[PDB]
Structures are given as structure tokens and as C-alpha cells.
């Protein structure tokens, strides 16, 4: 299909790569700011009925990365039958610890065809020392903060499929508030800030019954092949409960995801984004 690839060109560190529940949590806090409570609910209802956003993935200078489907994890031996038994062990493990794939290789992995993995990851995770100093005597109480530091021309992007009147109405305004307000924690040290660009991405896919996801779904039925995510964030200073999300690349079968709502003792209510982002995928016999 043809998606909308919202690039986020960073202006500093980030705290972590944004997952798709912290992108919808940020949009719901932007659209509550520039419009109000009576437009947050029309935002959720366009995702409940219609549109889908994904998680965010790194880019590095026109190479776009996408998560490896777990569909190629079993078949890998039957994938690689043009190799000898000295590198069918050493291709086979690097193609299994691999986390991301190019846009070209990802279109091959859905077809169950051979691929290569990225040589170089476009970001680094580092711990930067921070010291609290007493105003009267400058006593130091050092602590360590870990943030994502990007390369020169790398950044992060998420995808969006849905109607265009949602995109210009609720997402492209919110991703300009979020450019100057940041995404994630420590946004007052300049962390989750960015510029923003918009593009037209096309991803080829097969047609089948099963579909990868590119977002943390909160599935009603059990999926085909999954990988647990056990996160629960924060919401106006209250701790969310933890929720079993499924990581990107998990194969579901005709599952629409679902939004869970919570109460948390706020004047309004809290919708945890858990909708899936389907791409069709060709599986082996199980």
C-alpha cells in the first residue's frame, strides 16, 4: 500500500525510540492543547473506526528501516539453501539477532526470499552523567541518565494509513506542536525535539491471510507468532498499569487490535493505544 511517512529530524537526544502508544499519547496531549477535550474524543473515534499509526523506526539518509518479521524465524533454514554448511551457521544467526531491515529487504522477507541485514545501526544509546548541586555549598549528587544519540543524517519516522481528512486535521497539527514540545521524558533539557517532514512511502506486500504488525497491538485473540512487550507508561503524574503489548513483527490473523481505556482518577479518561498496523505476510506451514 501507500502510506504517509512522517519523518522526525531530531535536534538532540531522544529518551527512547517512540513506540506507538507513546505517539498516540503525545498526539492526544497535543490535540487536547490546541483544540480541547471535545476534539480528543473525535480523534480516538477516527482511530477506532479508521486510521492507523505505527511505531517509529530509524532512518539513515534515504534508507528506511522496518522491523524484521518473526515469520522468517522458523523458515530461515529453508530460506538459505544456496549456501554451504560453513556459512549456513553464520548467516543463520546474524539473520536472527537482526532487529531491523531495509525497505528493500523487508519486501523480500514477506515473500520468504533471502535477504541481508543492515551493517550499521543508525543510533547509539549512551549514559551521560548529571550532577545535582546544593545552592549553598555546591555539594554534588551525581546520577546517570541514558539517552539515544543519533548520527549525522539519521532520525526516526512513523507511518500513517487512513483518510486524509484525519491527517491534516489531527496529526499534521499535532506533529508541529510536538516538534517544539518534544516526545518522551526530559524534554526540558531539549530531548524529544525535532523538525518534521512528510513523505509518500510505498511498501509492497504479498496478499495472504496473515499479516505482520508494525505497532504494539493489544490483541483480542492469540496471534500466530508473537513477542511479548510488557510496558505501561505514565499519564499526568499517575502510573499506568502494565499491559502485555506485542512487539512489531508479530504475526496476527485478521485481528483489529483494540484500544484499552483506563480511568486513573483524572477529570477525563485515558485511552491506551493498542491498534495493529497490518501488512500481509507469507508464512510457512505453521
Amino acid at each position: 500500500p501507500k502510506f504517509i511517512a512522517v519523518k522526525l529530524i531530531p535536534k538532540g537526544p531522544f529518551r527512547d525510540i517512540p513506540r506507538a502508544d507513546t505517539l498516540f499519547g503525545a498526539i492526544g496531549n497535543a490535540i487536547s492543547a490546541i483544540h480541547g477535550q471535545s476534539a480528543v474524543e473525535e480523534l480516538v473515534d477516527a482511530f477506532v473506526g479508521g486510521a492507523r499509526i505505527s511505531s517509529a523506526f530509524p532512518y539513515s539518509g534515504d534508507t528506511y528501516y522496518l522491523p524484521k518479521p518473526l515469520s522468517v524465524e522458523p523458515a530461515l533454514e529453508g530460506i538459505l539453501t544456496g549456501l554451504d554448511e560453513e556459512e549456513r551457521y553464520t548467516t543463520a544467526k546474524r539473520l536472527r539477532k537482526a532487529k531491523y531491515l531495509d525497505l528493500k529487504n523487508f519486501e523480500l522477507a514477506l515473500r520468504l526470499r533471502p535477504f541481508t541485514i543492515p551493517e550499521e545501526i543508525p543510533y547509539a544509546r549512551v549514559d551521560v552523567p548529571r550532577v545535582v548541586l546544593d545552592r549553598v555549598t555546591q555539594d554534588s549528587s551525581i546520577y546517570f541518565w541514558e539517552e539515544i544519540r543519533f548520527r549525522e543524517k539519521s532520525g526516526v519516522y512513523f507511518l500513517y494509513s487512513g483518510p486524509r481528512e484525519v491527517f491534516d486535521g489531527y496529526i499534521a497539527p499535532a506533529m508541529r506542536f510536538l516538534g517544539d514540545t518534544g516526545i518522551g521524558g526530559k524534554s526540558t533539557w531539549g530531548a524529544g525535539l525535532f523538525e518534521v517532514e512528510f513523505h509518500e512511502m510505498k511498501i509492497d506486500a504479498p496478499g495472504s491471510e496473515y499479516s505482520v504488525t508494525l505497532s504494539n497491538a493489544l490483541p483480542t485473540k492469540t496471534p500466530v507468532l508473537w513477542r511479548l512487550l510488557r510496558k505501561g507508561g505514565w499519564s499526568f503524574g499517575r502510573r499506568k498499569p502494565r499491559m502485555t503489548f506485542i512487539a512489531e513483527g508479530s504475526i496476527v490473523k485478521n485481528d483489529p487490535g483494540g484500544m484499552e481505556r483506563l480511568e486513573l482518577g483524572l477529570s477525563h479518561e485515558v485511552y491506551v493505544y493498542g491498534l495493529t498496523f497490518p501488512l500481509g505476510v507469507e508464512l510457512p506451514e505453521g
Partner: protein, 747 residues
């Protein structure tokens, strides 16, 4: 005496008498001598069952086990009713133990009337072993050259075996260690290149024998070739996922005694599951082919009652591992119904490795689907009042967090006040008694049982008593079950009775004070175990790799056998009582921490000894780390696991120690670093001339960015150091290892 305890003990005493022929002390064929050796043992200090068990080494050679006549006369002559045994069931048990021997090693392993030979090593069939004990003390049985074992050395083997078998109880858990300690380095069949131990051929004959009995196969079902070719066996195989995120994801509040108790509690989770498969299926610990760092394989029977019990064990273990640990650790158990003919090579294709890769795929497809038997895994039921442990991160419902024994102003989860108390008892702890979950003294809980600590001055309680690092059932009640299990456990003590701290180790490193962290594992191990084509040959190749990492690593930290190690990069001479803590030592990998100084020399004292422990045909790969003492674990280990992975996907034989193109690589190879250290280090180990050294690293760091050549040339010249570094005026890239270490050895 029942029949299940007879078939288990008949196969375990079936190729007994193979040692006493090499000693040469009865009429020279083992199908009579082991008959004589057992009924002699039945006479003096003799149970009356040792006479009956010599119907198994007697009818061995199938010319004596021929045409159903000669047995029935003699088996009539005894008193088999005095044990309850029927005239037929005893006969039905000789055929099973006879069928089991052929599958195990097969009938192709059967040799002719050969002489005495050394057991060829399973890692290298050209070299061979001497004979020794399984001490784990003061002997590294490296494969030496072929030397025939002398015929009186077996008479020292038999005479100790006489006295040990006379004392030991007649039961499978009491004869497995006796035959292990003595008959490990004795070859099963004498031939050219034999790599199967005799204990492994007896450990595995009593496994396939009892899995034939529980399967229900009868003697005429063996006599007709019918218990073979039918899917009657069941390779249970189990595995853990997320061992790394379980042991090492602790905050900065968890001390080393806690981490050392996380590793010793993933063991008991692993031995609780295996010892519930063995007990509810009637099997013995001869069936456990290996149990090595979470990954264990068991041989069982294929009945619709066994598979019905495994699916409750896999149910109750995974539901346990989810209430306790919110999807950090999962247990994948699968089983493949194998036939009898798949226990060995047939035609030209290996049917055993082909039937074990069909089981590695059931497991591979299961670690994807991580908790698909909970039925509320994705049900977001909203539990309230969820606090959160500081040390590990666990949601805990409705408060209920015990005050920490360290600082009662902080509230930890209950299962870390256990692992502090357990982590404090690790000096004294001689094992664990495994018993019912609601009982006095139980610290930790497994999925099935509850584990008391059997301390030193204290009576053991429990049905089964696990004993760390000895094959001697010393002070156990005569009714309990003895499970020996080995653990790599070298901790430097403090002057208290306890395990030394991240501080207290690193305050004894000469130089700058760092916490050295090494993590490494055997290169390409799974392709070693696929040429093992019989279940006696896989059980051999799996113990010897496990014994290296359990018991021949604590020998290395002692510094024993520097003959076979030699001269290694040593900042100081290796002390008498090193300050090294062995956190986790797995069958194919290990995670050791200690001073930066001595964890450096140990990482070359390990590669050099492993290379000789094999014949050379298996190599290591190490990550090494230098850290501040007060660094958290999850940051430290995630670095070094990556820094081990860095020194692996390059070329997989590379030590890590301390240009954006793609033609360089960060990790030194082994001989490369040991040849850089032979030259560059004995010349500079220049009194307080560190500006010669520290600028030379900055001269080096223009080369990454041939301006460096004359800059070094004036610098080596404006002091007068011409002998030092002649080829330094790419060798400027590979001197960063030796400089940056020796600089740390001098403040």
C-alpha cells in the same frame, strides 16, 4: 525388590566386567568375569540381589544369549520368588537390557577380542586419555598422546571399585556416582578411535532399558525385532528463554551476593522441572542425557500416559513462571516420538541428529509463541494498587512488599529477601533439600517443590537432596534420593564469612581500581553435537564440555597446571587466593567478574586450557569489560554481552580487551594479542616517562582520523628510545591493546 528397580540396575551393571578383564583376574572373557565379579560381591558383605544381577553380564554376547534354553535352567536354580520376581518377568528383563545395549552405541560399536587401549577423546579422536578419577581436584586430564594403559592400573581401579560398591546402597541413585567416579575415563569398547566412555554407555543403557520397560515392550517384542521400528521413545527436551534478562536485570541496589543467588536459583528452577519429569514417569537420573544451563534433554517412553503427564508439567511450570516473573523467563518443553532405529546411524544418513533437529524446530517455534498456555495472557484485567520493586522490577499487587533487610526504609518484593538470605548462606551451603512447598526452612520455591537449604552443621531434610560439587553421598539419610550436580563457584571471600563485594574485590587490583567483567562462550558448539550419532556419544560430548566449565575452571582460578597453560599476559604473577567471582558458569559459556587485573590474565589462562582440553578443534570467544565498582549490573552486562557479540560476528575466535571503513575490526584474535604482548610488553614493564606513552596514544588517534610516523620519530628520538617500537615509525593500530593495559597497571 520390584522389576523397575531391576531393569534399571541390570543395564547399569551390564558391561561391568569389561574393566575386570583388563585387570585380568578370572577366565578371560567379560561375559563370565563380570558374572564372577558380581556374585563374589554378592557373597562377602553381599546383598542377595547382587547374585541375581549377574544374569545380565552373563548373557551378553548373544552366543550365550541364544535359543532360549540355557537361561531357563539357571534362572530356575535361584530363588526369584524371594524378591517377588516371576519366572518370566526376570527372563523378560534380560532381553530388554540386551536390546538396550545394541541401540545405545549400537551393534556396530561391538568390537572383537582386542587388547587394552586408551579412550580416544570425543573432541579429537587422534589423541587419547590416561586413566584417573573424577576428582575435579589437581588433575586436568588433557588428551595426551596415545599410550596404552598398563594392565595393573586396572587392578587399582577394580580394588577401589570393590570397596565402593560394597559400601554403596543397591539403588540407581547410589550406583550412578560410584560408576561415574571410577569408570568415566575408561573406554567402553576397545577399538581404533573409540570416543565413548564406559560410564556413558552404562548410563545410557539403563536409560533405554527402563524406557523400554515403561513402554511395556515384552521379550517376544524384542525377540521378533518389534520394539525397534516402532515409535516407543520420547525425546523430551526443555529450554529456558530470557536467562540473561532474569539474572542480570537488577538495579544498583542489588549486591553481588544477590546476583550470585540469582544464578543459583535459576538452577533450582531447572532441577525442579527435570526432577518432576523423572518422578511422575518412573524414570531415573540415568535418563537425563544432559542438563546444562537451562537446556536439558531426557529419554522417556512413548505412552499415552506419559504425554498426558508432560502436558500438566508444561502447564504448571509455565503458570508458575508467570505469577512469579511477569514474562521474563519462559520454559519451552517439546517432545519428539522417536523410534528404536533412530537411536543410531543407519545407511549413510545420521538418523539421530536428524531426529534431534526435528525437535530443535518444535522448540524454535515455541520460543516465538512465548506464553500461549495462560488463557488470560492478553486479557487486560485491571488489578489495582500496583507498587513496584526497586531491585528487580516487578509489579506487586496491593502493597505487600517486605521491608528490605539492608535498609528498612525501602520496600522490596518478597522474593528478594529470600535471595539475600540465600545469598548470605552461600559460604555454608552444601546443597539443597527439595521437598513440599509448605514446610519448615524452605527459602525459595520452584514450580513444583520447595527447597530447604542443607547447611553444613545441620541435618538434611527432604525426599531428594541435591548436593553441590561432589559425587559422595556423605551425610544423607539412607532413604533419601541423591542428586549430584556440579556448579562453578569460585568466590573470593571477605574477612567475614561471606562473598566479597564489588568494592572489596576491586580494591585489590594493582593499578587503577576497576571491576573487571568477562563473558564468553564456546564458538560453534551446536555443530559439534550433530556428528554425535548415538545417544552414548552425545552423552559423552555433553558431560566433558559441562565438566570443563563447572569443574575445570575453578582449577584454573587456583592456577593449577600452568604447564599446559604456559606463559600468558600477566600484569602481576598470579596470586595464591585470587579475587575473582564466578557469577554464572554455563555448559558452553560463562560470566565471571573480578579485579580488572586478574580477570585479564584469567581470560588467557582459560583460552589456553580449553584449547588443550579439546584437541584444538573447538575455540572460545571472550568479551572483557572495565567498569567502575558502583556501576549497575544491567548496564554492565548489556555492554559486555554486546562486547562479546562484537568479538564474535567478526570471526568468532577473538578476545575483546579494552575507522569508519569496514576493513578494520575491534577485537584482537588470540595469538595476535599473545604475540603483541610477547614483544611490546617485556620492554616497557622509562621511569615515570608516561608522556612518552600517553601522547603516543594521541599520536595513534590521528591515524584513525602518515603524519604520525615522523611525529613518533621525533618523540622516540627526543628521549632516546630507539630500541622501543622500531616498526612504529598496521602496527600503530594494534598497539592500543598493550599500551592501554600497562598504563593502567601503573596507576
Amino acid at each position: 525388590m520390584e522389576i523397575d528397580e531391576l531393569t534399571a540396575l541390570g543395564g547399569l551393571l551390564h558391561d561391568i566386567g569389561k574393566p575386570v578383564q583388563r585387570a585380568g583376574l578370572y577366565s578371560g572373557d567379560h561375559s563370565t568375569q563380570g558374572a564372577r565379579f558380581l556374585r563374589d560381591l554378592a557373597e562377602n558383605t553381599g546383598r542377595a540381589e547382587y547374585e541375581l544381577l549377574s544374569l545380565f553380564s552373563e548373557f551378553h554376547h548373544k552366543g550365550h544369549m541364544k535359543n532360549d534354553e540355557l537361561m531357563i535352567r539357571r534362572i530356575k536354580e535361584l530363588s526369584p520368588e524371594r524378591f517377588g520376581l516371576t519366572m518370566e518377568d526376570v527372563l523378560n528383563a534380560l532381553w530388554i537390557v540386551y536390546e538396550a545395549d545394541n541401540l545405545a552405541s549400537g551393534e556396530r560399536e561391538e568390537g572383537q577380542p582386542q587388547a587394552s587401549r586408551p579412550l580416544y577423546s570425543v573432541f579429537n579422536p587422534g589423541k587419547a586419555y590416561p586413566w584417573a578419577e573424577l576428582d575435579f581436584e589437581k588433575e586436568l586430564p588433557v588428551p595426551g598422546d596415545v599410550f596404552s594403559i598398563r594392565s595393573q592400573d586396572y587392578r587399582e581401579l577394580v580394588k577401589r571399585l570393590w570397596e565402593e560398591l560394597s559400601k554403596a546402597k543397591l539403588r540407581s541413585d547410589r550406583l550412578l556416582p560410584v560408576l561415574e567416579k571410577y569408570l568415566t575415563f575408561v573406554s567402553s569398547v576397545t577399538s581404533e578411535g573409540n570416543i565413548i566412555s564406559l560410564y556413558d554407555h552404562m548410563r545410557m543403557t539403563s536409560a533405554i532399558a527402563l524406557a523400554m520397560l515403561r513402554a511395556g515392550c515384552t521379550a517376544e517384542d524384542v525377540r521378533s525385532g518389534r520394539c525397534r521400528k516402532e515409535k516407543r521413545f520420547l525425546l523430551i527436551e526443555g529450554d529456558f528463554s530470557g536467562i540473561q534478562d532474569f539474572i542480570y536485570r537488577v538495579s544498583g541496589k542489588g549486591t553481588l551476593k544477590y546476583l550470585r543467588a540469582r544464578s543459583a536459583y535459576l538452577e533450582l528452577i531447572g532441577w525442579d522441572v527435570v526432577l518432576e519429569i523423572l518422578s511422575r514417569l518412573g524414570l531415573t537420573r540415568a535418563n537425563v542425557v544432559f542438563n546444562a544451563g537451562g537446556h536439558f534433554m531426557i529419554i522417556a517412553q512413548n505412552t499415552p500416559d506419559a504425554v498426558k503427564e508432560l502436558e500438566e508439567i508444561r502447564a504448571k511450570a509455565v503458570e508458575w513462571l508467570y505469577r512469579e516473573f511477569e514474562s521474563d523467563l519462559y520454559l519451552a518443553i517439546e517432545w519428539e516420538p522417536v523410534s528404536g532405529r533412530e537411536f543410531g546411524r543407519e545407511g549413510g544418513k545420521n538418523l539421530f541428529a536428524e531426529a534431534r533437529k526435528r525437535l530443535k524446530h518444535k522448540l524454535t517455534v515455541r520460543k516465538l509463541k512465548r506464553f500461549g498456555e495462560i488463557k488470560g495472557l492478553f486479557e487486560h484485567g485491571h488489578t489495582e494498587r500496583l507498587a513496584e520493586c526497586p531491585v528487580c522490577g516487578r509489579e506487586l499487587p496491593e502493597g505487600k512488599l517486605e521491608p528490605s533487610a539492608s535498609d528498612p526504609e525501602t520496600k522490596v518484593c518478597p522474593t528478594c529477601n529470600r535471595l539475600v538470605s540465600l545469598g548470605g548462606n552461600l559460604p555454608k551451603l552444601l546443597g539443597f533439600g527439595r521437598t513440599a512447598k509448605n514446610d519448615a526452612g524452605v527459602l525459595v520455591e520452584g514450580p513444583f517443590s520447595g527447597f530447604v537449604p542443607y547447611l553444613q552443621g545441620g541435618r538434611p531434610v527432604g525426599e531428594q537432596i541435591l548436593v553441590k560439587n561432589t559425587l559422595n553421598p556423605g551425610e544423607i539419610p539412607e532413604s533419601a534420593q541423591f542428586v549430584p550436580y556440579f556448579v562453578a563457584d569460585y568466590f573470593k571471600k571477605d574477612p567475614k564469612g561471606g562473598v566479597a563485594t564489588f568494592e572489596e574485590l576491586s580494591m585489590a587490583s594493582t593499578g587503577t581500581r576497576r571491576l573487571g567483567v568477562m563473558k564468553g562462550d564456546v564458538d560453534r558448539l551446536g555443530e559439534f553435537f550433530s556428528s554425535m550419532d548415538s545417544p552414548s556419544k552425545l552423552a559423552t560430548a555433553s558431560r566433558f564440555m559441562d565438566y570443563f566449565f563447572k569443574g575445570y575452571i575453578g582449577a584454573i582460578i587456583e592456577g593449577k597446571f600452568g604447564y599446559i597453560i604456559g606463559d600468558v599476559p600477566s600484569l602481576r604473577d598470579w596470586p595464591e587466593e585470587p579475587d575473582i567471582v564466578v557469577v554464572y558458569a554455563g555448559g558452553d559459556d560463562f560470566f565471571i567478574v573480578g579485579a580488572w587485573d586478574q580477570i585479564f590474565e584469567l581470560a588467557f589462562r582459560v583460552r589456553r586450557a580449553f584449547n588443550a582440553y579439546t584437541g584444538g578443534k573447538l575455540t572460545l570467544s571472550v568479551g572483557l569489560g572495565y567498569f567502575d565498582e558502583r556501576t549497575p549490573i544491567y548496564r554492565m552486562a548489556d555492554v559486555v554481552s554486546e562486547r562479546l557479540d562484537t568479538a564474535k560476528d567478526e570471526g568468532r575466535n577473538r578476545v575483546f580487551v579494552v575507522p569508519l571503513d569496514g576493513k578494520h575490526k575491534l577485537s584482537y584474535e588470540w595469538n595476535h594479542y599473545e604475540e603483541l604482548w610477547r614483544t611490546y610488553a617485556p620492554r616497557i614493564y622509562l621511569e615515570s616517562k608516561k608522556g612518552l606513552l600517553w601522547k603516543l596514544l594521541e599520536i595513534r588517534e590521528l591515524y584513525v582520523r602518515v603524519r604520525w610516523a615522523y611525529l613518533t620519530a621525533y618523540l622516540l628520538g627526543r628521549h632516546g628510545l630507539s630500541d622501543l617500537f622500531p616498526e612504529l615509525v598496521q602496527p600503530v593500530y594494534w598497539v592500543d591493546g598493550v599500551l592501554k593495559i600497562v598504563l593502567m597497571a601503573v596507576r
